[PDB]
Design a protein around this ligand. Structure first.
Ligand SMILES: Nc1ncnc2c1ncn2[C@@H]1O[C@H](COP(=O)(O)OP(=O)(O)OP(=O)(O)O)[C@@H](O)[C@H]1O
Ligand SMILES: [Mg+2]
Lengths: 109, 55, 448
Protein backbone atom coordinates (compact mmCIF):
# COMPACT_ATOMS: atom_id res chain seq x y z
CA UNK A 1 0.00 0.00 0.00
CA UNK A 2 1.17 3.51 -0.89
CA UNK A 3 1.46 4.51 2.78
CA UNK A 4 3.94 1.69 3.38
CA UNK A 5 5.65 2.43 0.06
CA UNK A 6 5.92 6.12 0.98
CA UNK A 7 7.25 5.15 4.41
CA UNK A 8 9.82 2.82 2.82
CA UNK A 9 10.62 5.63 0.37
CA UNK A 10 11.39 7.80 3.41
CA UNK A 11 13.42 4.97 4.99
CA UNK A 12 15.36 4.83 1.72
CA UNK A 13 15.67 8.63 1.48
CA UNK A 14 17.22 8.76 4.97
CA UNK A 15 19.64 5.83 4.61
CA UNK A 16 23.31 6.65 5.32
CA UNK A 17 24.30 3.60 3.25
CA UNK A 18 22.52 4.94 0.16
CA UNK A 19 24.55 8.13 0.60
CA UNK A 20 28.19 7.75 -0.47
CA UNK A 21 30.78 9.54 1.65
CA UNK A 22 33.85 10.40 -0.42
CA UNK A 23 35.39 12.35 2.48
CA UNK A 24 35.64 9.11 4.49
CA UNK A 25 39.12 7.58 4.36
CA UNK A 26 38.60 4.06 2.93
CA UNK A 27 41.92 2.74 4.26
CA UNK A 28 41.61 3.55 7.97
CA UNK A 29 39.78 0.99 10.13
CA UNK A 30 39.24 1.35 13.90
CA UNK A 31 40.45 -0.93 16.65
CA UNK A 32 37.39 -3.06 17.46
CA UNK A 33 38.12 -2.67 21.21
CA UNK A 34 38.06 1.15 21.09
CA UNK A 35 34.63 1.43 22.77
CA UNK A 36 35.32 1.45 26.53
CA UNK A 37 33.32 2.53 29.58
CA UNK A 38 34.39 5.42 31.82
CA UNK A 39 35.17 2.89 34.56
CA UNK A 40 37.43 0.98 32.16
CA UNK A 41 39.16 4.17 30.98
CA UNK A 42 39.78 5.33 34.55
CA UNK A 43 41.03 1.86 35.49
CA UNK A 44 43.30 1.69 32.45
CA UNK A 45 44.52 5.23 33.22
CA UNK A 46 46.06 3.94 36.47
CA UNK A 47 41.58 16.36 36.70
CA UNK A 48 38.10 14.78 36.45
CA UNK A 49 38.01 14.41 40.25
CA UNK A 50 35.88 17.35 41.21
CA UNK A 51 33.40 17.13 44.13
CA UNK A 52 32.81 15.81 47.65
CA UNK A 53 29.85 15.11 49.96
CA UNK A 54 28.23 17.86 52.01
CA UNK A 55 28.88 18.01 55.76
CA UNK A 56 25.44 19.52 56.44
CA UNK A 57 22.64 17.32 57.80
CA UNK A 58 20.12 16.50 55.09
CA UNK A 59 16.38 17.05 55.40
CA UNK A 60 14.00 14.08 55.53
CA UNK A 61 11.32 13.56 52.86
CA UNK A 62 8.67 10.88 52.41
CA UNK A 63 9.80 8.23 49.94
CA UNK A 64 6.21 7.82 48.70
CA UNK A 65 4.76 11.33 48.38
CA UNK A 66 7.93 13.44 48.71
CA UNK A 67 6.35 15.53 51.47
CA UNK A 68 8.47 16.05 54.61
CA UNK A 69 8.77 12.94 56.75
CA UNK A 70 9.00 13.02 60.56
CA UNK A 71 9.04 9.22 60.62
CA UNK A 72 11.31 6.40 59.46
CA UNK A 73 9.69 2.96 59.39
CA UNK A 74 12.01 0.51 61.22
CA UNK A 75 10.67 -2.47 59.24
CA UNK A 76 11.16 -1.40 55.61
CA UNK A 77 13.28 1.75 56.20
CA UNK A 78 10.97 3.84 54.04
CA UNK A 79 10.45 7.42 55.19
CA UNK A 80 6.81 8.45 55.38
CA UNK A 81 4.66 11.52 55.99
CA UNK A 82 1.75 10.18 58.05
CA UNK A 83 -0.31 7.16 59.10
CA UNK A 84 -2.14 7.11 55.75
CA UNK A 85 1.15 6.48 53.92
CA UNK A 86 2.39 4.07 56.60
CA UNK A 87 -0.81 2.09 55.93
CA UNK A 88 0.08 1.69 52.24
CA UNK A 89 3.78 1.06 52.97
CA UNK A 90 3.12 -1.90 55.28
CA UNK A 91 0.87 -3.55 52.65
CA UNK A 92 2.94 -2.81 49.54
CA UNK A 93 3.35 -5.53 46.92
CA UNK A 94 6.37 -7.43 48.12
CA UNK A 95 8.93 -6.08 45.64
CA UNK A 96 7.80 -2.45 45.73
CA UNK A 97 9.64 -1.42 48.91
CA UNK A 98 13.02 -1.74 47.20
CA UNK A 99 11.82 0.55 44.38
CA UNK A 100 10.93 3.43 46.72
CA UNK A 101 14.42 3.07 48.20
CA UNK A 102 16.03 2.79 44.75
CA UNK A 103 14.43 6.07 43.67
CA UNK A 104 16.83 7.69 46.16
CA UNK A 105 19.61 5.22 45.30
CA UNK A 106 19.14 3.34 48.56
CA UNK A 107 18.85 -0.45 48.63
CA UNK A 108 18.74 -3.34 51.06
CA UNK A 109 21.85 -4.55 49.20
CA UNK B 1 20.83 38.77 65.55
CA UNK B 2 21.95 35.79 63.48
CA UNK B 3 22.94 32.17 63.22
CA UNK B 4 26.40 31.59 64.70
CA UNK B 5 28.45 30.68 61.63
CA UNK B 6 31.85 30.87 63.35
CA UNK B 7 33.36 31.12 66.83
CA UNK B 8 37.13 31.65 66.66
CA UNK B 9 38.93 32.34 69.95
CA UNK B 10 41.55 34.89 68.90
CA UNK B 11 43.81 34.86 71.97
CA UNK B 12 45.03 32.60 74.76
CA UNK B 13 40.88 36.33 75.61
CA UNK B 14 39.46 37.88 72.45
CA UNK B 15 36.84 36.01 70.44
CA UNK B 16 35.78 36.55 66.86
CA UNK B 17 32.20 35.46 66.17
CA UNK B 18 30.55 35.08 62.78
CA UNK B 19 26.81 35.68 62.54
CA UNK B 20 24.53 35.05 59.57
CA UNK B 21 21.01 35.98 58.53
CA UNK B 22 19.11 35.22 55.32
CA UNK B 23 20.49 38.53 54.01
CA UNK B 24 24.20 38.11 54.72
CA UNK B 25 26.83 37.28 57.31
CA UNK B 26 28.95 39.45 59.59
CA UNK B 27 32.04 39.11 61.78
CA UNK B 28 32.41 40.70 65.22
CA UNK B 29 35.38 41.20 67.51
CA UNK B 30 34.28 40.36 71.06
CA UNK B 31 35.88 41.65 74.25
CA UNK B 32 36.60 38.80 76.73
CA UNK B 33 33.72 40.11 78.88
CA UNK B 34 31.04 39.83 76.17
CA UNK B 35 32.77 36.62 75.06
CA UNK B 36 32.28 35.02 78.48
CA UNK B 37 28.69 36.28 78.50
CA UNK B 38 28.29 34.53 75.13
CA UNK B 39 30.10 31.55 76.72
CA UNK B 40 28.06 31.56 79.94
CA UNK B 41 25.06 31.08 77.75
CA UNK B 42 25.67 27.78 75.96
CA UNK B 43 26.14 29.25 72.48
CA UNK B 44 27.63 26.98 69.81
CA UNK B 45 28.05 27.08 66.05
CA UNK B 46 24.62 26.65 64.48
CA UNK B 47 22.82 28.37 67.35
CA UNK B 48 20.74 31.49 66.75
CA UNK B 49 21.63 34.34 69.09
CA UNK B 50 20.65 37.91 69.91
CA UNK B 51 23.39 40.40 70.82
CA UNK B 52 23.14 44.02 71.88
CA UNK B 53 26.44 45.57 70.87
CA UNK B 54 26.83 48.29 73.50
CA UNK B 55 24.77 47.12 76.48
CA UNK C 1 -19.69 17.01 46.83
CA UNK C 2 -19.47 20.68 45.83
CA UNK C 3 -15.68 21.24 46.31
CA UNK C 4 -15.04 18.99 43.30
CA UNK C 5 -18.41 18.98 41.51
CA UNK C 6 -18.28 22.77 41.00
CA UNK C 7 -14.80 22.72 39.44
CA UNK C 8 -14.38 23.33 35.69
CA UNK C 9 -13.34 20.41 33.46
CA UNK C 10 -9.62 19.72 33.96
CA UNK C 11 -7.07 21.33 31.66
CA UNK C 12 -4.96 18.48 30.23
CA UNK C 13 -1.90 18.63 27.90
CA UNK C 14 -1.04 16.07 25.18
CA UNK C 15 2.08 14.06 25.97
CA UNK C 16 5.17 15.00 23.94
CA UNK C 17 8.42 13.27 23.05
CA UNK C 18 11.27 13.51 20.54
CA UNK C 19 10.12 12.57 17.04
CA UNK C 20 11.19 12.63 13.40
CA UNK C 21 10.61 15.81 11.38
CA UNK C 22 10.63 16.67 7.68
CA UNK C 23 13.81 15.91 5.74
CA UNK C 24 16.69 18.39 5.54
CA UNK C 25 18.78 18.13 2.33
CA UNK C 26 22.56 18.62 2.43
CA UNK C 27 23.26 22.37 2.33
CA UNK C 28 25.73 22.76 -0.54
CA UNK C 29 25.31 26.54 -0.19
CA UNK C 30 27.34 26.29 3.01
CA UNK C 31 30.25 24.64 1.18
CA UNK C 32 30.02 27.36 -1.50
CA UNK C 33 30.16 30.20 1.05
CA UNK C 34 32.94 28.47 3.01
CA UNK C 35 35.16 28.47 -0.09
CA UNK C 36 34.16 32.04 -1.01
CA UNK C 37 34.99 33.42 2.45
CA UNK C 38 38.56 34.64 3.04
CA UNK C 39 41.39 32.14 3.60
CA UNK C 40 42.14 31.20 7.19
CA UNK C 41 38.83 32.62 8.45
CA UNK C 42 36.53 29.60 7.92
CA UNK C 43 35.97 26.60 10.18
CA UNK C 44 33.37 23.95 10.89
CA UNK C 45 32.15 24.48 14.46
CA UNK C 46 30.73 21.44 16.28
CA UNK C 47 29.28 21.57 19.79
CA UNK C 48 29.18 17.97 21.06
CA UNK C 49 26.01 18.36 23.11
CA UNK C 50 24.95 15.08 24.71
CA UNK C 51 21.41 16.32 24.13
CA UNK C 52 22.16 17.79 20.69
CA UNK C 53 25.26 17.87 18.50
CA UNK C 54 25.19 21.39 17.04
CA UNK C 55 27.18 22.06 13.87
CA UNK C 56 27.53 24.81 11.30
CA UNK C 57 29.73 27.51 9.81
CA UNK C 58 31.77 29.87 11.99
CA UNK C 59 30.82 32.79 9.71
CA UNK C 60 27.11 32.23 10.51
CA UNK C 61 25.12 33.37 13.54
CA UNK C 62 23.45 30.02 14.30
CA UNK C 63 24.26 26.33 13.79
CA UNK C 64 23.20 24.76 10.52
CA UNK C 65 22.53 21.45 12.27
CA UNK C 66 21.27 20.27 15.67
CA UNK C 67 21.24 16.51 15.98
CA UNK C 68 20.90 13.93 18.80
CA UNK C 69 24.12 11.91 19.26
CA UNK C 70 22.37 8.66 18.28
CA UNK C 71 22.51 6.11 15.48
CA UNK C 72 20.33 3.29 14.17
CA UNK C 73 21.20 0.39 11.87
CA UNK C 74 18.96 -2.53 10.91
CA UNK C 75 17.69 -4.72 8.07
CA UNK C 76 14.06 -4.98 7.09
CA UNK C 77 14.83 -8.55 6.11
CA UNK C 78 11.83 -8.82 3.77
CA UNK C 79 13.27 -5.79 1.96
CA UNK C 80 16.80 -7.18 2.25
CA UNK C 81 18.72 -3.91 2.00
CA UNK C 82 20.39 -2.56 5.13
CA UNK C 83 19.31 0.82 6.50
CA UNK C 84 21.43 3.08 8.69
CA UNK C 85 20.69 6.34 10.48
CA UNK C 86 22.33 8.86 12.80
CA UNK C 87 20.29 11.60 14.45
CA UNK C 88 16.60 12.43 14.07
CA UNK C 89 16.48 10.06 11.11
CA UNK C 90 16.33 7.65 13.98
CA UNK C 91 12.66 8.37 14.53
CA UNK C 92 13.25 9.34 18.17
CA UNK C 93 10.18 3.69 13.09
CA UNK C 94 12.05 0.77 14.64
CA UNK C 95 13.70 3.06 17.24
CA UNK C 96 16.55 0.53 17.10
CA UNK C 97 18.91 3.04 18.65
CA UNK C 98 22.33 3.47 20.22
CA UNK C 99 23.89 6.64 21.63
CA UNK C 100 27.42 8.00 21.38
CA UNK C 101 27.63 9.10 25.03
CA UNK C 102 27.77 7.00 28.16
CA UNK C 103 24.40 7.35 29.86
CA UNK C 104 24.06 10.59 31.82
CA UNK C 105 27.76 11.28 31.34
CA UNK C 106 29.57 14.11 29.61
CA UNK C 107 32.11 11.96 27.80
CA UNK C 108 31.87 10.18 24.44
CA UNK C 109 32.18 6.39 24.67
CA UNK C 110 30.61 4.66 21.61
CA UNK C 111 33.03 6.00 19.00
CA UNK C 112 31.43 4.07 16.13
CA UNK C 113 28.16 5.85 16.95
CA UNK C 114 30.03 9.16 17.14
CA UNK C 115 31.73 8.43 13.80
CA UNK C 116 28.34 7.82 12.16
CA UNK C 117 27.12 11.11 13.67
CA UNK C 118 30.16 12.92 12.24
CA UNK C 119 29.47 11.34 8.85
CA UNK C 120 25.93 12.74 9.09
CA UNK C 121 27.24 16.22 9.99
CA UNK C 122 29.70 16.39 7.08
CA UNK C 123 27.07 15.11 4.63
CA UNK C 124 24.59 17.78 5.72
CA UNK C 125 27.28 20.48 5.54
CA UNK C 126 27.82 19.43 1.91
CA UNK C 127 31.36 18.06 2.21
CA UNK C 128 32.68 17.02 -1.21
CA UNK C 129 36.35 16.17 -0.51
CA UNK C 130 39.88 19.89 4.18
CA UNK C 131 38.24 22.34 6.59
CA UNK C 132 39.27 23.39 10.11
CA UNK C 133 37.10 21.93 12.87
CA UNK C 134 36.27 23.63 16.16
CA UNK C 135 34.98 21.05 18.64
CA UNK C 136 33.70 21.27 22.21
CA UNK C 137 34.87 19.07 25.08
CA UNK C 138 33.60 18.07 28.48
CA UNK C 139 35.27 19.77 31.40
CA UNK C 140 38.35 17.69 32.26
CA UNK C 141 37.58 15.43 29.30
CA UNK C 142 39.41 12.12 29.60
CA UNK C 143 42.71 11.79 27.68
CA UNK C 144 41.60 8.57 25.96
CA UNK C 145 38.39 10.26 24.82
CA UNK C 146 40.28 13.27 23.46
CA UNK C 147 42.63 10.88 21.63
CA UNK C 148 39.86 8.76 20.08
CA UNK C 149 37.96 11.82 18.81
CA UNK C 150 41.05 13.48 17.32
CA UNK C 151 42.08 10.13 15.80
CA UNK C 152 38.70 10.01 14.05
CA UNK C 153 39.19 13.60 12.84
CA UNK C 154 42.73 13.05 11.50
CA UNK C 155 42.73 9.40 10.39
CA UNK C 156 39.18 8.98 9.08
CA UNK C 157 38.57 12.53 7.82
CA UNK C 158 42.12 13.90 7.49
CA UNK C 159 41.02 17.40 8.47
CA UNK C 160 43.68 20.14 8.48
CA UNK C 161 43.30 21.24 12.11
CA UNK C 162 41.27 20.64 15.26
CA UNK C 163 40.77 22.68 18.44
CA UNK C 164 39.06 21.66 21.70
CA UNK C 165 37.34 24.08 24.06
CA UNK C 166 34.86 23.95 26.92
CA UNK C 167 31.32 24.73 25.77
CA UNK C 168 30.37 26.70 28.90
CA UNK C 169 33.50 28.85 28.54
CA UNK C 170 32.67 29.60 24.90
CA UNK C 171 29.24 30.69 26.15
CA UNK C 172 30.88 32.94 28.75
CA UNK C 173 32.87 34.53 25.90
CA UNK C 174 29.91 35.13 23.58
CA UNK C 175 28.52 37.19 26.43
CA UNK C 176 30.90 39.91 27.58
CA UNK C 177 32.47 37.71 30.24
CA UNK C 178 35.71 38.99 31.74
CA UNK C 179 35.77 37.57 35.24
CA UNK C 180 33.01 35.70 36.98
CA UNK C 181 31.67 32.41 38.26
CA UNK C 182 30.31 30.32 35.38
CA UNK C 183 27.49 28.03 36.52
CA UNK C 184 26.60 25.48 33.83
CA UNK C 185 23.78 22.98 34.12
CA UNK C 186 23.69 20.76 31.03
CA UNK C 187 22.21 17.46 29.92
CA UNK C 188 25.10 15.49 31.42
CA UNK C 189 26.13 17.41 34.54
CA UNK C 190 26.39 20.71 36.39
CA UNK C 191 29.69 22.60 36.63
CA UNK C 192 30.73 25.73 38.53
CA UNK C 193 33.87 27.23 36.96
CA UNK C 194 35.62 30.38 38.27
CA UNK C 195 36.97 32.51 35.41
CA UNK C 196 39.66 35.13 36.04
CA UNK C 197 40.77 37.67 33.41
CA UNK C 198 39.11 35.49 30.73
CA UNK C 199 41.08 32.45 31.98
CA UNK C 200 39.19 29.60 33.63
CA UNK C 201 40.67 28.29 36.89
CA UNK C 202 39.87 24.69 36.01
CA UNK C 203 41.87 23.45 39.01
CA UNK C 204 39.10 25.13 41.06
CA UNK C 205 36.14 24.01 38.94
CA UNK C 206 33.67 21.55 40.49
CA UNK C 207 31.22 19.12 38.87
CA UNK C 208 27.81 18.14 40.23
CA UNK C 209 26.76 14.86 38.59
CA UNK C 210 23.16 15.97 37.99
CA UNK C 211 21.63 17.36 34.82
CA UNK C 212 18.73 17.39 32.41
CA UNK C 213 19.26 13.67 31.83
CA UNK C 214 19.11 12.78 35.54
CA UNK C 215 16.02 14.97 35.92
CA UNK C 216 14.28 13.04 33.13
CA UNK C 217 15.36 9.69 34.60
CA UNK C 218 14.35 10.69 38.15
CA UNK C 219 10.98 12.05 36.96
CA UNK C 220 10.44 8.66 35.30
CA UNK C 221 11.32 6.73 38.48
CA UNK C 222 8.86 8.86 40.47
CA UNK C 223 5.99 8.51 37.98
CA UNK C 224 6.52 4.74 37.84
CA UNK C 225 6.30 4.74 41.64
CA UNK C 226 3.23 7.02 41.64
CA UNK C 227 1.38 4.57 39.36
CA UNK C 228 2.96 1.36 40.67
CA UNK C 229 -0.45 -0.34 40.42
CA UNK C 230 0.18 -0.05 36.66
CA UNK C 231 -0.29 2.66 34.04
CA UNK C 232 -1.55 1.91 30.52
CA UNK C 233 0.73 4.40 28.77
CA UNK C 234 4.30 3.29 28.12
CA UNK C 235 6.28 5.66 30.34
CA UNK C 236 9.56 6.70 28.71
CA UNK C 237 12.45 9.01 29.55
CA UNK C 238 11.89 10.97 26.32
CA UNK C 239 8.41 11.88 27.61
CA UNK C 240 9.49 12.87 31.14
CA UNK C 241 12.17 15.08 29.56
CA UNK C 242 9.35 17.11 28.00
CA UNK C 243 7.43 17.04 31.30
CA UNK C 244 10.44 18.45 33.18
CA UNK C 245 10.93 21.12 30.51
CA UNK C 246 7.27 22.17 30.37
CA UNK C 247 6.13 21.87 33.98
CA UNK C 248 8.99 21.85 36.51
CA UNK C 249 10.16 25.02 38.25
CA UNK C 250 12.43 25.93 41.17
CA UNK C 251 10.87 26.77 44.53
CA UNK C 252 11.99 30.02 46.13
CA UNK C 253 11.26 28.45 49.54
CA UNK C 254 10.89 24.71 49.03
CA UNK C 255 9.90 23.51 52.52
CA UNK C 256 7.21 26.19 52.87
CA UNK C 257 5.82 25.48 49.38
CA UNK C 258 6.09 21.68 49.62
CA UNK C 259 4.45 21.17 53.02
CA UNK C 260 1.21 22.77 51.78
CA UNK C 261 1.33 21.50 48.19
CA UNK C 262 -1.30 18.72 48.47
CA UNK C 263 -3.88 20.79 50.34
CA UNK C 264 -7.13 20.31 48.39
CA UNK C 265 -7.66 24.08 48.34
CA UNK C 266 -5.98 25.30 45.15
CA UNK C 267 -4.62 21.85 44.28
CA UNK C 268 -6.47 22.24 40.96
CA UNK C 269 -4.03 25.09 40.23
CA UNK C 270 -0.88 23.44 41.60
CA UNK C 271 -1.71 20.28 39.63
CA UNK C 272 -0.89 19.91 35.95
CA UNK C 273 -2.00 16.91 33.91
CA UNK C 274 -0.87 15.24 30.68
CA UNK C 275 -2.99 12.87 28.57
CA UNK C 276 -1.49 9.69 27.19
CA UNK C 277 -3.32 8.43 24.07
CA UNK C 278 -6.42 6.29 24.49
CA UNK C 279 -9.39 4.84 22.64
CA UNK C 280 -12.91 4.00 23.80
CA UNK C 281 -15.59 1.85 22.18
CA UNK C 282 -16.33 9.53 57.02
CA UNK C 283 -13.52 7.71 55.21
CA UNK C 284 -13.56 8.89 51.60
CA UNK C 285 -11.35 9.49 48.59
CA UNK C 286 -12.01 13.21 49.16
CA UNK C 287 -10.15 12.92 52.49
CA UNK C 288 -7.25 10.78 51.21
CA UNK C 289 -3.84 12.39 50.71
CA UNK C 290 -2.89 9.61 48.28
CA UNK C 291 -5.93 10.37 46.12
CA UNK C 292 -4.78 14.00 45.95
CA UNK C 293 -1.24 12.78 45.21
CA UNK C 294 -2.44 10.58 42.33
CA UNK C 295 -5.73 12.02 41.01
CA UNK C 296 -6.24 15.45 42.59
CA UNK C 297 -9.57 17.08 43.40
CA UNK C 298 -11.62 15.07 40.91
CA UNK C 299 -13.27 11.74 41.66
CA UNK C 300 -11.64 8.81 39.89
CA UNK C 301 -13.03 5.71 38.20
CA UNK C 302 -11.28 3.04 36.08
CA UNK C 303 -14.21 3.02 33.62
CA UNK C 304 -13.08 6.38 32.22
CA UNK C 305 -10.37 5.43 29.72
CA UNK C 306 -8.99 8.97 29.36
CA UNK C 307 -8.83 9.48 33.13
CA UNK C 308 -6.97 6.18 33.47
CA UNK C 309 -4.50 7.31 30.76
CA UNK C 310 -3.32 10.48 32.53
CA UNK C 311 -0.52 11.13 35.04
CA UNK C 312 -0.74 13.88 37.66
CA UNK C 313 2.57 15.61 38.41
CA UNK C 314 1.75 17.63 41.56
CA UNK C 315 4.74 17.43 44.00
CA UNK C 316 7.01 16.40 41.10
CA UNK C 317 6.72 19.96 39.73
CA UNK C 318 9.20 21.16 42.39
CA UNK C 319 10.76 18.00 43.83
CA UNK C 320 12.59 17.29 40.56
CA UNK C 321 14.52 20.60 40.15
CA UNK C 322 15.38 20.67 43.87
CA UNK C 323 17.81 17.76 43.36
CA UNK C 324 20.35 20.38 42.27
CA UNK C 325 20.00 22.21 45.60
CA UNK C 326 19.51 19.14 47.85
CA UNK C 327 21.03 16.17 46.02
CA UNK C 328 21.57 13.81 48.97
CA UNK C 329 18.18 14.49 50.57
CA UNK C 330 15.96 14.12 47.51
CA UNK C 331 17.90 11.69 45.28
CA UNK C 332 20.64 10.33 47.56
CA UNK C 333 23.44 11.86 45.48
CA UNK C 334 26.34 12.11 47.93
CA UNK C 335 27.36 15.53 46.58
CA UNK C 336 27.01 19.05 47.96
CA UNK C 337 24.34 21.19 46.35
CA UNK C 338 24.74 24.02 43.87
CA UNK C 339 24.57 26.84 46.45
CA UNK C 340 27.01 25.00 48.72
CA UNK C 341 29.37 24.43 45.77
CA UNK C 342 29.35 28.08 44.67
CA UNK C 343 29.70 29.15 48.30
CA UNK C 344 32.68 26.85 48.84
CA UNK C 345 34.40 28.28 45.73
CA UNK C 346 33.67 31.96 46.45
CA UNK C 347 34.27 31.83 50.22
CA UNK C 348 36.89 29.11 50.80
CA UNK C 349 38.90 28.57 47.60
CA UNK C 350 39.34 31.84 45.70
CA UNK C 351 40.39 34.05 48.68
CA UNK C 352 43.01 31.36 49.38
CA UNK C 353 44.60 31.56 45.92
CA UNK C 354 47.88 33.49 45.62
CA UNK C 355 47.82 36.64 43.54
CA UNK C 356 44.12 36.41 42.65
CA UNK C 357 43.57 39.97 44.04
CA UNK C 358 39.99 40.81 45.17
CA UNK C 359 38.45 37.41 45.56
CA UNK C 360 35.51 36.99 45.97
CA UNK C 361 34.51 40.51 44.96
CA UNK C 362 35.91 40.23 41.43
CA UNK C 363 34.26 36.86 40.70
CA UNK C 364 31.19 37.56 42.85
CA UNK C 365 30.15 40.53 40.67
CA UNK C 366 29.29 38.16 37.80
CA UNK C 367 27.87 34.75 38.62
CA UNK C 368 26.79 33.59 35.18
CA UNK C 369 24.31 30.88 34.15
CA UNK C 370 24.82 28.66 31.09
CA UNK C 371 23.39 25.47 29.62
CA UNK C 372 19.78 24.53 29.03
CA UNK C 373 19.13 22.87 32.40
CA UNK C 374 19.46 26.31 34.05
CA UNK C 375 16.36 27.53 32.19
CA UNK C 376 13.96 26.78 35.07
CA UNK C 377 11.79 29.55 36.47
CA UNK C 378 13.22 31.12 39.64
CA UNK C 379 16.52 29.29 39.04
CA UNK C 380 18.53 32.52 39.02
CA UNK C 381 16.55 34.04 41.90
CA UNK C 382 16.97 30.89 44.01
CA UNK C 383 20.72 30.84 43.33
CA UNK C 384 21.08 34.53 44.26
CA UNK C 385 19.06 34.13 47.49
CA UNK C 386 21.17 31.13 48.48
CA UNK C 387 24.52 32.81 47.84
CA UNK C 388 23.44 36.09 49.48
CA UNK C 389 23.18 34.37 52.88
CA UNK C 390 26.70 32.95 52.50
CA UNK C 391 28.38 36.24 51.50
CA UNK C 392 29.38 39.28 53.58
CA UNK C 393 26.35 41.54 53.91
CA UNK C 394 25.88 44.01 51.05
CA UNK C 395 28.46 42.29 48.84
CA UNK C 396 27.86 43.12 45.13
CA UNK C 397 26.45 39.74 44.06
CA UNK C 398 24.84 39.57 40.63
CA UNK C 399 23.42 36.41 39.05
CA UNK C 400 23.03 36.72 35.27
CA UNK C 401 21.74 34.56 32.41
CA UNK C 402 23.23 34.05 28.97
CA UNK C 403 21.14 35.58 26.19
CA UNK C 404 20.45 32.00 25.05
CA UNK C 405 21.22 29.02 27.25
CA UNK C 406 21.93 26.40 24.53
CA UNK C 407 23.02 28.00 21.24
CA UNK C 408 25.24 30.65 22.86
CA UNK C 409 27.96 28.09 23.59
CA UNK C 410 28.10 27.33 19.85
CA UNK C 411 28.01 31.06 19.01
CA UNK C 412 30.98 31.63 21.32
CA UNK C 413 33.03 28.95 19.57
CA UNK C 414 31.98 30.32 16.16
CA UNK C 415 33.11 33.81 17.14
CA UNK C 416 36.33 32.49 18.67
CA UNK C 417 36.93 29.93 15.88
CA UNK C 418 39.47 31.87 13.80
CA UNK C 419 40.87 34.48 16.20
CA UNK C 420 44.63 34.67 16.71
CA UNK C 421 43.99 33.04 20.09
CA UNK C 422 42.33 30.11 18.33
CA UNK C 423 44.87 29.81 15.50
CA UNK C 424 47.61 29.86 18.13
CA UNK C 425 45.68 27.04 19.84
CA UNK C 426 45.01 25.06 16.64
CA UNK C 427 46.77 21.71 16.27
CA UNK C 428 47.64 20.85 12.68
CA UNK C 429 47.39 17.34 11.23
CA UNK C 430 51.19 17.16 11.11
CA UNK C 431 51.36 18.31 14.74
CA UNK C 432 48.91 15.52 15.56
CA UNK C 433 51.08 13.07 13.60
CA UNK C 434 54.03 14.31 15.66
CA UNK C 435 52.41 14.65 19.08
CA UNK C 436 49.50 12.20 18.96
CA UNK C 437 45.86 12.79 19.79
CA UNK C 438 46.43 13.24 23.52
CA UNK C 439 48.22 16.53 22.81
CA UNK C 440 46.31 19.79 23.29
CA UNK C 441 47.34 23.44 23.15
CA UNK C 442 46.95 25.07 26.57
CA UNK C 443 44.55 28.00 26.30
CA UNK C 444 42.09 30.03 28.35
CA UNK C 445 39.00 28.22 27.01
CA UNK C 446 40.51 24.71 26.95
CA UNK C 447 41.41 21.91 29.33
CA UNK C 448 44.80 21.74 31.03
N1 LIG D 1 13.34 25.85 28.79
C1 LIG D 1 13.93 24.80 29.37
N2 LIG D 1 13.73 24.61 30.70
C2 LIG D 1 14.32 23.57 31.29
N3 LIG D 1 15.12 22.64 30.75
C3 LIG D 1 15.29 22.85 29.44
C4 LIG D 1 14.75 23.88 28.69
N4 LIG D 1 15.15 23.79 27.37
C5 LIG D 1 15.91 22.72 27.35
N5 LIG D 1 16.04 22.11 28.57
C6 LIG D 1 16.81 20.90 28.87
O1 LIG D 1 18.18 21.21 28.82
C7 LIG D 1 18.92 20.04 28.39
C8 LIG D 1 19.82 20.41 27.24
O2 LIG D 1 20.97 21.11 27.77
P1 LIG D 1 22.16 21.55 26.84
O3 LIG D 1 21.66 21.56 25.40
O4 LIG D 1 22.78 22.81 27.29
O5 LIG D 1 23.16 20.33 26.97
P2 LIG D 1 24.29 19.66 26.08
O6 LIG D 1 25.13 20.68 25.42
O7 LIG D 1 23.60 18.67 25.15
O8 LIG D 1 25.11 18.83 27.14
P3 LIG D 1 26.62 18.50 27.53
O9 LIG D 1 27.48 19.70 27.33
O10 LIG D 1 26.56 18.04 28.99
O11 LIG D 1 27.00 17.32 26.64
C9 LIG D 1 17.88 18.96 28.08
O12 LIG D 1 17.75 18.06 29.18
C10 LIG D 1 16.59 19.77 27.88
O13 LIG D 1 15.43 19.02 28.22
MG1 LIG E 1 26.76 21.51 26.56
Amino acid sequence: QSAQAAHQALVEQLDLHSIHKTFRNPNWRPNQRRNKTIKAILGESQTNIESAPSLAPMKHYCDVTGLPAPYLDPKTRLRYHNKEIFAMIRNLPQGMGEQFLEARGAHTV
Amino acid sequence: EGEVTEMTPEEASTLLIGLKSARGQKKLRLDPSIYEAIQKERVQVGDVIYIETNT
Amino acid sequence: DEPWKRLPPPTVYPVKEARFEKYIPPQLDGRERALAQPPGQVAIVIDNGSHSVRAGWNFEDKPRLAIPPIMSKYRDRKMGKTFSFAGSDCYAARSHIRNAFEAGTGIVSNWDVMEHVLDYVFVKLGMNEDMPIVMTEAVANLPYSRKSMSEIIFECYGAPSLVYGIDSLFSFRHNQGQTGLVVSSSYSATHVIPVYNRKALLSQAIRLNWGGWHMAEYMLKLLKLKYYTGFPGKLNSSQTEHMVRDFCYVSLDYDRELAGYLDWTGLEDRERIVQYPYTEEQRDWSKSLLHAFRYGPRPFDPSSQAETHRVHLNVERIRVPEVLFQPAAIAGVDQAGLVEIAGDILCQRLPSLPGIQDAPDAFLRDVFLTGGNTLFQNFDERLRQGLMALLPVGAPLRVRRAQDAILDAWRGAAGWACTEEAKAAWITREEYLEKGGEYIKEHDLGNA
